[PDB]
C-alpha cells in the first residue's frame, strides 16, 4: 500500500473529481497521502467531514476556503490546516491548484 | 501541538534552513506536517534519514532528486514518496518552491 518514489505529472493520470475539479493522487503510503487537485474557477469542493487530518497547499489560484464555519480568502503561499472531523471546503475564486494532504491515507481515493 | 486554522504566508516567519534555503511551517499536529521550503539555484538539501513517512511536491523550479540511490531530475507538477528511513536528498537545478509533507510530524522543525 504505497506508490511509487517518483510520481510525474505526464505518468499519472487526473481523475475527474466533480465539475471543474480533476486530481492526481501523487506520493502517498498508509499514514500519508499527497493529492494534487486542479479547480476550474467557479468550481466547489464540497463540504465533507473526515476522521484524517488534512493539511492543504494553494500552490495557485485563489479560494475562499471555510472551516467550522470560519472564513478566509487564501492564495498562492498559504495553507489551511483541517483537524480531525471539522467541516471543510471551499470554492475556487480564481483557476488554481491545491495540494491536499492527508493523515492517514484517503482510502476511498484509491479504492 | 497544532497550528492555526488559516496559515497565510504574509504572517508566518521564514526560517533559514541552509545556505539558498528557506522555509515556513504552515499546518500540522502530531501526525501531519506540511512544510514550504523556498530553494535557490544551486542548493542543496542535503541527505537525510528519518523514520517519518514524507511526500513531496514541486510547485516549481526543477531539482535532482535521490531516493535510495535512484536519482531522477523533477519539475513542477511533479511528486516524490520517500518510505520511512529511506535516504534522500535534493539539488536545486532551478529556483523553486518544494511542498515537504510529513507523518509523523518532525518535532526538530518546531523545537
Ligand atoms: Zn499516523
Ligand atoms: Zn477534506
Ligand atoms: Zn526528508
Redesign the interface.
Given at each position: 500500500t504505497?506508490?511509487?518514489?517518483?510520481?510525474?505529472?505526464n505518468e499519472i493520470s487526473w481523475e475527474q473529481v466533480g465539475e471543474g475539479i480533476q486530481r492526481q493522487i501523487?506520493?502517498?503510503?498508509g499514514?500519508?497521502?499527497?493529492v494534487?487537485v486542479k479547480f476550474q474557477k467557479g468550481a466547489i469542493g464540497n463540504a465533507h467531514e473526515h476522521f484524517h487530518?488534512?493539511?492543504?497547499?494553494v500552490?495557485s489560484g485563489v479560494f475562499e476556503?471555510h472551516?467550522?464555519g470560519?472564513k478566509?480568502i487564501?492564495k498562492?503561499?498559504?495553507?489551511?490546516?483541517?483537524?480531525p472531523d471539522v467541516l471543510h471546503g471551499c470554492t475556487c475564486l480564481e483557476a488554481g491548484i491545491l495540494?491536499d494532504?492527508?493523515?492517514?491515507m484517503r482510502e476511498d481515493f484509491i479504492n
Open positions: 504505497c506508490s511509487k518514489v517518483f510520481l510525474l505529472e501523487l506520493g502517498y503510503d499514514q500519508l497521502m499527497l494534487k487530518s488534512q493539511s492543504t497547499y500552490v476556503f472551516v467550522n470560519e478566509k487564501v498562492a503561499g498559504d495553507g489551511i490546516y483541517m483537524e495540494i494532504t492527508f493523515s492517514p
